[PDB]
Amino acid sequence: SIDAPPSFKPAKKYSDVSGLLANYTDPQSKLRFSTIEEFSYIRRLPSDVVTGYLALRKATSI
Amino acid sequence: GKARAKAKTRSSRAGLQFPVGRVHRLLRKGNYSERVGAGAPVYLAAVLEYLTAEILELAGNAARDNKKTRIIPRHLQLAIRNDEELNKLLGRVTIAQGGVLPNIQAVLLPK
Amino acid sequence: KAKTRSSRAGLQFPVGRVHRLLRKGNYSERVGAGAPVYLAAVLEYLTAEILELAGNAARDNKKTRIIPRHLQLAIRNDEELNKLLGRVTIAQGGVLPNIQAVLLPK
Amino acid sequence: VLRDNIQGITKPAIRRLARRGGVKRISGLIYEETRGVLKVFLENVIRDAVTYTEHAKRKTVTAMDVVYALKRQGRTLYGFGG
Amino acid sequence: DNIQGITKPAIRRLARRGGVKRISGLIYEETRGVLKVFLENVIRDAVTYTEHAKRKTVTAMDVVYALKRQGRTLYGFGG
Amino acid sequence: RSRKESYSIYVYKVLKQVHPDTGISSKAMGIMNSFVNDIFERIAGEASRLAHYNKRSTITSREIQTAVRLLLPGELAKHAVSEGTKAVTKYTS
Amino acid sequence: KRSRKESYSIYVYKVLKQVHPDTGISSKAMGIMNSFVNDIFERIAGEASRLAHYNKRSTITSREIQTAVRLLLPGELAKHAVSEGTKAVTKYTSAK
Amino acid sequence: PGTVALREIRRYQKSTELLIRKLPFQRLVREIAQDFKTDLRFQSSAVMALQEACEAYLVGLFEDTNLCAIHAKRVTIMPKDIQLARRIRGERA
Amino acid sequence: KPHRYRPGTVALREIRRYQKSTELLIRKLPFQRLVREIAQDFKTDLRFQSSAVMALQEACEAYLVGLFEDTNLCAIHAKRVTIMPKDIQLARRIRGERA
Amino acid sequence: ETEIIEGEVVEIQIDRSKVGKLTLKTTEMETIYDLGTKMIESLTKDKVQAGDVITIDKAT
């Protein structure tokens, strides 16, 4: 009984490649970006960095 | 020695439905290897769940269009042969009393 | 004096090696005594049958060394060996010479 | 009459099987040839089915034997056991 | 683009081993498709076997294992 | 008596998740039994052979996952891989 | 020092010298024969494994490989292999 | 004419029964099995499975035969097509 | 003026010449480049053993020779000597690949 | 100032509160969206199918 309780406040969403306020997502990769150049960059990226970003902030993908 | 009464099954702990214990027993008794891992039966049960769910969903969809409330071998046959993935997975199998898909070649059709 | 089981049974292929492979191959937990003997006998028979035909083919080719071509000829010409080895391909062995009747000139 | 039972596979039966196969016209020389083919198939299954019956020291051929015989020939059958 | 590396005389030679006298001129473009597809399956297995052993080099036994799983057995390469 | 055994009461139990008002005939039950144990034997044998090829003693989650990848033709392979990974992840925790 | 490799090179060569005293053999043929023996042995062994499961057994018996080898081989070849293996086992059991 | 045959074609491709009479098939199977060993007994399910497998084989054979016949700009199937189908499939030569 | 051979005899000459020898037909370098590019399309940064690529080459050649033999049977069945793609499609379908 | 969501809808999925999910697609990006209970009614009232170019006022 010394660990902090789970937060009841919803957690914001941030761009996985620029650290800015995200407002969209991506069904093909399940990541989040902020602008058009972010979308082009994330599409140009291979699967290795995508799965690394997904595993960083752990998600339904291992 | 005291133990928990009516302990939970491994299938329920895994969220699956096929018997993980029976799969593990079959793996151990089948002499595929001298030692069988821990998570292998769970994974195999999950794959079997997926396959059974897919084939049964398709069979039920096929049977619904035939105004029938019960699955028969014909509905399974129609379900498998109409999906390319399941057809190539089950290329060399024979379904008993399942008939053949109805298809006519363009040349043999009148006019 | 230690005598090998192959010599005791009058074979050439190793009974001990076959028994070890059967035991370590996960085919069953218990391996009989005569199983490696009988398996080695069958393997020796098959090897002799293939080899004698390969040597006959090599002699017909007027050469004293067996190459994959002679093995291919021996397998394909014999009906039973071809039936046994239907789905196998011999490396750099080619195919038998064959011309269809209708393709001959006039 | 002393007649071979391969002729027991009647011509209408072969026509029915062909029509299930999707063929419009049938030449007259198929009828004797198909039976021959039907022989060869039964010569490659029953032979196996008997051998298993040998290995179990049994005298009655069971459905499991024929299912295993068909299984090894890449012609697996569903719904008759196994 | 490297499928064009399978030149036309090579296809002619492969046909000639089979025992055919005349070759259509449009056969090659379709035949290069078959070489394109039949080769896209063994590699699917060949890399995958390689990826099981934590190694990233395609050894001569992986292709043998793939061809064995598909139903085409070859001898002389450690089979 | 005899524990003939079967998955009859399992695949049927799966049916309610996809079609809650659909029945199964006895012959269809036998068909599904044969299908499931055939796929079981296929996957188990492939995993065995692969483990023997890699000179290992234990058939693990990754070996059977690779067997599924080899055996399942297309999108079924990746979807079953995801399903199995989710199942094992929930089993561990 | 690295590991030791395993093959059937000497035994097939000995059989060849026993059947054709003056006929040699190449390296590629050596590899092909090795693969052939491996494949045939694996076929007979793996096919024999299933009969034990089918008949609820635990041991591989000589009278069981006898049934296994007459399914993989055609008529005359299987008959001759069975006869020679029976002779081999009969000669082996007389000395033990 | 040429349309009553297509009536059958469409009828049989829907119904799923045994197109060969049971008694002659049983006699044929018994006579074929007599040579291997005398005085045999047969499970009924074994005979039914035999007949089902044989009918499936024949249906597939006739499908391939029809493809062969269509290839040569014909409508009638002749043994020249069955031999080709068997040869190229792999049961002979 | 120069002696010209009939169209067709050179065909049988090449048939007899190639059906006796057992060399590799496809040039080694294009085949290696093709398999390398295919592998990189699947998984980049891969290493290949020379024996592996030559075994792929021999398997492909055996497959093509069998396919062309079946194609020849199909073409002769249609009262022809020239092979057209429909013969290959028919063979591939009856064998059970394509369809 | 106003917030406007304009684009082509690809797929809509509403379960049985209710959970909703839809994927919008412009010519330069795609985006998945989870719907609240109000948006469920706002989308069921005006039947929206695949391949429809829609404009939504966020504040309303």
Side-chain angles (χ1 to χ4, degrees), chain A residues 4-6 9-22 24 26-27 29-47 49-56 58-61, chain B residues 1-3 5 7-110, chain C, chain D residues 1-9 11-70 72-82, chain E residues 1-6 8-79, chain F residues 1-85 87-93, chain G residues 1-90 92-95, chain H residues 1-13 15-93, chain I residues 1-97 99, chain J residues 1-15 19-60:
Chain A
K9 192 76 63 65
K12 314 271 212 153
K13 294 185 218 275
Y14 295 82
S15 60
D16 292 356
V17 298
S18 69
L20 300 183
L21 275 151
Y24 321 94
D26 192 286
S29 68
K30 307 186 197 171
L31 277 77
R32 50 188 67 146
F33 60 97
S34 174
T35 58
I36 192 66
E37 55 276 8
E38 301 214 2
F39 184 83
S40 74
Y41 175 110
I42 191 167
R43 291 300 214 163
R44 284 191 301 71
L45 287 191
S47 177
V49 287
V50 164
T51 191
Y53 280 128
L54 294 174
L56 189 144
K58 93 199 173 203
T60 185
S61 70
Chain B
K2 57 172 174 61
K8 59 152 51 183
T9 63
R10 296 171 71 187
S11 301
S12 81
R13 181 174 171 84
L16 296 178
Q17 266 204 3
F18 282 163
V20 179
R22 176 171 294 171
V23 163
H24 201 192
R25 191 267 316 275
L26 284 179
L27 279 176
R28 288 186 292 174
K29 194 152 301 313
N31 215 15
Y32 304 102
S33 62
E34 67 273 58
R35 261 145 53 90
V36 171
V42 171
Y43 183 77
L44 183 46
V47 170
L48 291 163
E49 285 309 328
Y50 184 23
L51 286 194
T52 302
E54 186 90 331
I55 186 168
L56 274 185
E57 180 180 1
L58 290 185
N61 282 357
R64 188 216 40 204
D65 299 358
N66 200 350
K67 324 172 181 73
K68 286 292 186 76
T69 56
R70 215 174 289 162
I71 300 295
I72 62 170
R74 181 77 169 105
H75 303 143
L76 289 169
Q77 174 86 260
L78 291 160
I80 300 174
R81 308 266 166 265
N82 285 23
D83 182 9
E84 67 289 340
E85 294 293 328
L86 284 170
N87 194 27
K88 73 181 318 300
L89 175 60
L90 284 86
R92 314 279 297 119
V93 304
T94 293
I95 302 298
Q97 287 206 110
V100 56
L101 213 61
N103 263 347
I104 308 300
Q105 303 283 112
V107 176
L108 294 93
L109 286 169
Chain C
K1 186 69 171 66
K3 38 180 157 52
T4 54
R5 314 146 80 171
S6 296
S7 69
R8 194 203 316 281
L11 282 71
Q12 313 297 323
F13 282 167
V15 174
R17 190 180 277 196
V18 163
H19 200 184
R20 169 196 73 136
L21 284 173
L22 273 177
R23 264 205 306 283
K24 214 173 51 163
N26 284 94
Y27 304 81
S28 189
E29 69 275 16
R30 286 162 88 73
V31 188
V37 174
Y38 184 76
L39 185 57
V42 170
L43 264 58
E44 175 209 72
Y45 169 73
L46 294 184
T47 303
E49 202 58 22
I50 190 167
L51 267 182
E52 76 163 1
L53 267 52
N56 273 6
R59 192 161 46 69
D60 280 4
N61 210 349
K62 64 90 176 179
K63 295 183 146 297
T64 187
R65 194 172 295 163
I66 288 178
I67 62 170
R69 283 269 322 162
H70 307 121
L71 290 169
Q72 174 86 260
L73 269 291
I75 297 169
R76 299 282 170 258
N77 287 287
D78 198 84
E79 66 275 61
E80 275 161 339
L81 275 297
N82 185 36
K83 185 183 321 163
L84 185 67
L85 284 77
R87 304 264 314 170
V88 311
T89 62
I90 314 297
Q92 54 188 330
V95 55
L96 306 190
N98 214 45
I99 295 282
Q100 286 279 67
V102 176
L103 295 175
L104 303 177
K106 306 303 291 184
Chain D
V1 289
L2 180 62
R3 60 192 309 279
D4 56 355
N5 298 119
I6 179 63
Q7 296 294 321
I9 311 298
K11 154 197 166 176
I14 299 144
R15 307 195 90 259
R16 276 195 292 269
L17 266 166
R19 290 288 163 54
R20 180 167 285 176
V23 297
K24 279 177 69 175
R25 304 203 85 257
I26 306 283
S27 55
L29 291 203
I30 302 286
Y31 293 180
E32 202 51 37
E33 172 203 22
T34 291
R35 299 185 192 102
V37 164
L38 192 142
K39 284 294 294 296
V40 164
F41 194 80
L42 274 73
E43 296 295 327
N44 298 7
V45 168
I46 298 183
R47 198 209 295 297
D48 284 2
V50 173
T51 51
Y52 288 76
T53 306
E54 294 293 328
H55 191 247
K57 290 181 221 73
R58 271 195 277 97
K59 288 211 200 66
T60 300
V61 192
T62 72
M64 278 321 313
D65 297 7
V66 63
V67 175
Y68 293 131
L70 290 166
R72 79 176 321 277
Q73 291 172 27
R75 294 188 50 78
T76 74
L77 171 62
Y78 280 7
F80 268 92
Chain E
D1 168 89
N2 274 117
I3 178 64
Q4 282 332 299
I6 310 296
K8 178 181 131 43
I11 309 282
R12 306 197 97 261
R13 270 186 305 258
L14 297 155
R16 290 293 159 72
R17 196 163 258 140
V20 294
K21 278 149 90 142
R22 200 162 161 208
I23 306 303
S24 166
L26 61 83
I27 283 297
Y28 320 120
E29 193 48 16
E30 59 84 20
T31 293
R32 292 197 203 69
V34 180
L35 200 70
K36 191 63 168 93
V37 63
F38 168 95
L39 195 150
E40 291 314 271
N41 272 25
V42 285
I43 294 187
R44 294 295 87 192
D45 294 28
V47 178
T48 309
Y49 277 100
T50 300
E51 291 305 19
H52 188 93
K54 289 66 169 159
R55 84 174 163 254
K56 57 158 164 74
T57 187
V58 188
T59 61
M61 289 295 291
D62 295 25
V63 299
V64 175
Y65 291 147
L67 291 165
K68 177 51 154 307
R69 185 197 60 85
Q70 298 184 352
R72 322 162 54 67
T73 291
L74 77 165
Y75 291 166
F77 278 96
Chain F
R1 189 52 79 160
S2 296
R3 244 288 210 286
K4 294 289 113 291
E5 230 102 29
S6 115
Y7 304 70
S8 304
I9 62 170
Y10 283 81
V11 298
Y12 193 10
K13 196 189 314 300
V14 176
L15 188 59
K16 300 325 193 328
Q17 275 59 36
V18 298
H19 281 152
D21 57 358
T22 300
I24 301 298
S25 181
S26 70
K27 273 74 67 177
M29 201 45 98
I31 295 289
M32 293 297 302
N33 192 359
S34 299
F35 165 75
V36 65
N37 64 7
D38 187 2
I39 301 301
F40 161 77
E41 271 175 30
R42 285 204 224 167
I43 300 290
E46 173 46 70
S48 172
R49 207 169 331 115
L50 199 160
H52 187 284
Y53 284 160
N54 271 259
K55 63 213 171 313
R56 299 311 188 70
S57 296
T58 54
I59 48 174
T60 63
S61 61
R62 70 155 312 145
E63 268 92 5
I64 189 164
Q65 187 212 78
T66 311
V68 158
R69 205 82 62 69
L70 269 296
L71 192 147
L72 288 181
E75 297 289 323
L76 290 174
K78 75 163 276 164
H79 281 346
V81 161
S82 294
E83 183 66 24
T85 50
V88 176
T89 308
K90 207 195 93 72
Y91 185 80
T92 62
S93 69
Chain G
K1 193 174 186 292
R2 71 214 188 290
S3 306
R4 63 178 293 163
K5 300 290 94 176
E6 182 81 86
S7 65
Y8 293 61
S9 299
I10 62 170
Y11 304 83
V12 65
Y13 192 112
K14 184 200 321 283
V15 174
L16 172 57
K17 279 328 188 180
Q18 182 264 297
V19 65
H20 292 355
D22 63 358
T23 308
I25 191 166
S26 177
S27 78
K28 317 292 190 144
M30 272 325 307
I32 289 167
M33 271 302 189
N34 188 4
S35 308
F36 163 81
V37 176
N38 268 38
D39 180 74
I40 298 312
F41 153 72
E42 190 277 331
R43 281 189 198 171
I44 308 144
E47 206 276 344
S49 169
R50 274 181 302 260
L51 277 73
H53 270 57
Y54 291 176
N55 282 311
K56 294 176 291 303
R57 285 276 163 286
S58 279
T59 62
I60 297 299
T61 308
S62 65
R63 66 142 269 157
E64 175 276 356
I65 303 294
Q66 188 270 331
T67 300
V69 299
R70 45 162 70 211
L71 299 182
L72 287 169
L73 301 169
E76 295 311 317
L77 202 67
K79 180 67 174 66
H80 277 79
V82 164
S83 183
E84 183 173 359
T86 306
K87 284 332 300 163
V89 176
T90 293
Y92 177 84
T93 187
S94 295
Chain H
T3 187
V4 62
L6 196 143
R7 196 146 72 221
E8 323 195 321
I9 288 276
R10 287 186 186 273
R11 189 257 293 260
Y12 283 133
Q13 269 194 345
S15 76
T16 75
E17 63 280 9
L18 277 298
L19 314 172
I20 307 167
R21 305 292 149 240
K22 314 302 187 66
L23 265 290
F25 197 87
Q26 194 161 177
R27 266 91 55 78
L28 172 64
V29 164
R30 289 180 188 274
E31 291 317 273
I32 286 187
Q34 264 169 10
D35 63 358
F36 296 138
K37 164 161 65 163
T38 61
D39 291 331
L40 270 297
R41 305 180 90 88
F42 280 100
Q43 191 80 234
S44 62
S45 277
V47 188
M48 292 335 298
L50 279 168
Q51 189 165 358
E52 270 280 330
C54 297
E55 283 216 39
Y57 178 49
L58 267 297
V59 163
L61 189 47
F62 280 132
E63 172 69 27
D64 290 6
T65 297
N66 203 56
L67 271 295
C68 286
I70 301 299
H71 189 68
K73 313 156 180 96
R74 281 185 274 104
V75 176
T76 311
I77 62 161
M78 290 163 292
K80 185 222 292 183
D81 301 329
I82 297 185
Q83 312 300 19
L84 181 63
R86 283 170 59 83
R87 162 56 190 78
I88 184 156
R89 186 183 293 172
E91 301 96 290
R92 181 195 42 80
Chain I
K1 184 63 65 68
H3 179 224
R4 183 174 168 87
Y5 264 100
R6 270 185 173 267
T9 304
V10 186
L12 280 74
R13 186 200 307 298
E14 301 215 330
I15 300 294
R16 296 220 185 69
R17 194 250 300 290
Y18 281 124
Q19 215 160 36
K20 294 321 282 301
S21 68
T22 48
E23 184 196 19
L24 284 195
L25 274 42
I26 305 93
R27 307 287 105 193
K28 313 284 196 284
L29 274 77
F31 199 85
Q32 189 160 101
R33 290 201 312 276
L34 164 67
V35 301
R36 258 160 163 71
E37 298 279 309
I38 282 174
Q40 74 70 20
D41 288 333
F42 181 76
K43 169 64 167 51
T44 187
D45 292 328
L46 270 175
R47 294 211 174 294
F48 275 91
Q49 295 189 347
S50 67
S51 62
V53 54
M54 308 303 152
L56 288 165
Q57 199 155 351
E58 292 180 353
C60 293
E61 294 201 332
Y63 179 55
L64 265 295
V65 168
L67 178 63
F68 277 131
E69 207 280 336
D70 289 311
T71 300
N72 173 79
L73 276 294
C74 295
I76 311 192
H77 188 252
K79 298 307 148 296
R80 287 189 290 104
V81 298
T82 297
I83 56 161
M84 311 145 48
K86 54 199 288 289
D87 292 331
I88 282 178
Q89 321 291 9
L90 173 77
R92 202 141 197 281
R93 184 201 191 310
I94 297 169
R95 296 220 297 212
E97 293 186 349
Chain J
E1 310 180 40
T2 307
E3 301 305 19
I4 296 90
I5 308 296
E6 45 192 319
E8 187 268 8
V9 60
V10 176
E11 173 51 15
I12 184 67
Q13 263 274 0
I14 310 299
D15 72 345
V19 180
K21 185 135 60 194
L22 79 167
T23 69
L24 275 79
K25 179 262 289 180
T26 48
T27 55
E28 318 193 0
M29 50 190 85
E30 306 179 357
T31 297
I32 204 159
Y33 276 139
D34 266 13
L35 299 177
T37 306
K38 285 196 272 284
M39 263 295 168
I40 300 307
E41 283 325 291
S42 176
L43 270 296
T44 48
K45 184 184 184 299
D46 314 328
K47 273 83 67 179
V48 162
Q49 295 301 323
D52 304 344
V53 174
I54 59 166
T55 285
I56 305 173
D57 283 88
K58 192 174 77 69
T60 285

